[PDB]
Design a protein around this ligand. Structure first.
Ligand SMILES: OC[C@H]1O[C@H](O)[C@H](O)[C@@H](O)[C@@H]1O[C@@H]1O[C@H](CO[C@H]2OC[C@@H](O)[C@H](O)[C@H]2O)[C@@H](O[C@@H]2O[C@H](CO[C@H]3OC[C@@H](O)[C@H](O)[C@H]3O)[C@@H](O[C@@H]3O[C@H](CO[C@H]4OC[C@@H](O)[C@H](O)[C@H]4O)[C@@H](O)[C@H](O)[C@H]3O)[C@H](O)[C@H]2O)[C@H](O)[C@H]1O
Length: 346
């Protein structure tokens, strides 16, 4: 049954979080394909109940489920039923396991081909009703799940030039804030559990700089304390390639970031919805990385988790700790990183 819970309480209960990345967010194989074709298109196995249960049994309490939607929508913006039901099926795995789950709209945003949601005046005007129709469908299909399920409006919205970190024009902020409101409006309108469900709105590019935070506007909500703000972090940029250890510069950089977020968001919680070692050319840590590089990954994660706890936040690891064939066993890909995260959190 449904038990209404505040945004801050949800974030406090997330504990250690994980991103089921390159899975339902995988895209580019075209329209009209079997569900499993999309899900495995980027090298991940089909998700199982055992995976969600594994996370719960091993000290994690929340999973983010990225979803890319555009290849599953027809000309009128209707979502393929098999796709929607597969999203629902994976949510159900997570609910069964006792996890919090986040469902979003992922590579429909940002710099890849097929992205259609953009912080741009013309694009917003042309896609606003399509966007609201999408969220109405998602909210209705997932309506029956309780407070452990959250919706996240959009992943990493960029302007027309795909400008990371910050938009080139201030109108970009208008478009984002407008989308954000449309997202909240469309979900709340469906009523039921969606009337009070905790929802997540991301900053421009999910970035964290001074201008992006100052020009972020939280949507108006008829109910209290059911909104969360989300940002991402691979800071300091390219540290995995340029650093030999998680040094004082790395540590101070993270400390400053959390300080800036907590100073900005005084009354609403924020989360680090995706973080990791991914840097230039998306080079990232794996089990075949040198021990010093795996230690570098572990120290980042340890610091990220502890700072987040200190700042009444929560974190979701992007992919690397639980990846590919390791999901099938299931087993951690990076046990030492996870152990560092668990020790930091507990
Ligand atoms: O960067 C870290 C994270 O940062 C934020 O949190 C983001 O929200 C996360 O999404 C992001 O995660 C990374 O996302 C990458 C996708 O980004 C793209 O879309 C968003 C845009 O903004 C961005 O600019 C785009 O680059 C994701 O990259 C994908 O990785 C897949 C798997 O690759 C892994 O396994 C295979 C191995 O060889 C790789 O070294 C290893 O990294 C790639 O899968 C392959 O895809 C091709 C088909 O590719 C076509 O269609 C997809 C399109 O993206 C390609 O450009 C196009 O050629 C298929 O034939 C192969 O069999 C697959 O292996 C995928 O192509 C690639 O985009 C990244 O891994 C993830 O960390």
């Amino acid at each position: 049954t449904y038990m209404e819970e505040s945004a801050q309480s949800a974030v406090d209960n997330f504990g250690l979080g994980f991103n089921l990345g390159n899975t339902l967010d995988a895209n580019g194989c075209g329209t009209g394909k079997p569900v499993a074709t999309y899900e495995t298109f980027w090298g991940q196995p089909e998700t199982t109940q055992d995976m969600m249960t594994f996370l719960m049994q091993n000290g994690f309490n929340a999973v983010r489920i990225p979803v890319t939607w555009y290849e599953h929508m027809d000309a009128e913006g209707n979502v393929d039923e098999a796709w929607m039901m597969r999203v629902k099926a994976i949510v159900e795995y997570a609910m069964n396991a006792g996890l919090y789950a986040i469902v979003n709209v992922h590579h429909d945003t940002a710099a890849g081909s097929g992205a259609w949601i953009k912080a741009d005046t013309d694009v917003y005007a042309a896609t606003k009703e399509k966007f609201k129709k999408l969220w109405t469908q998602i909210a209705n299909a997932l309506a029956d799940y309780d407070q452990h399920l959250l919706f996240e409006g959009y992943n990493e919205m960029l302007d027309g030039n795909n400008s990371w970190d910050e938009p080139q024009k201030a109108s970009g902020y208008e478009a984002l804030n407008n989308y954000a409101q449309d997202f909240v409006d469309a979900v709340r309108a469906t009523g039921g559990n969606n009337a009070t469900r905790n929802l997540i709105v991301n900053t421009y590019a999910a970035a964290k700089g001074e201008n992006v935070l100052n020009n972020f506007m939280l949507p108006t909500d008829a109910v209290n304390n059911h909104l969360i703000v989300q940002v991402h972090s691979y800071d300091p940029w390219n540290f995995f390639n340029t650093k030999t250890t998680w040094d004082s510069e790395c540590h101070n950089t993270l400390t400053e970031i959390f300080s800036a977020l907590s100073k900005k968001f005084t009354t609403i919680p924020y989360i680090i919805g995706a973080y990791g070692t991914h840097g230039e050319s998306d080079i990232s840590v794996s089990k075949s990385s040198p021990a010093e590089k795996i230690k570098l990954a572990a120290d980042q994660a340890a610091d990220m988790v502890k700072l987040a706890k200190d700042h009444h936040s929560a974190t979701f690891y992007w992919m690397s700790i639980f990846d590919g064939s390791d999901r099938i066993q299931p087993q951690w890909s990076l046990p030492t990183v996870v152990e560092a995260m668990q020790e930091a959190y507990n």
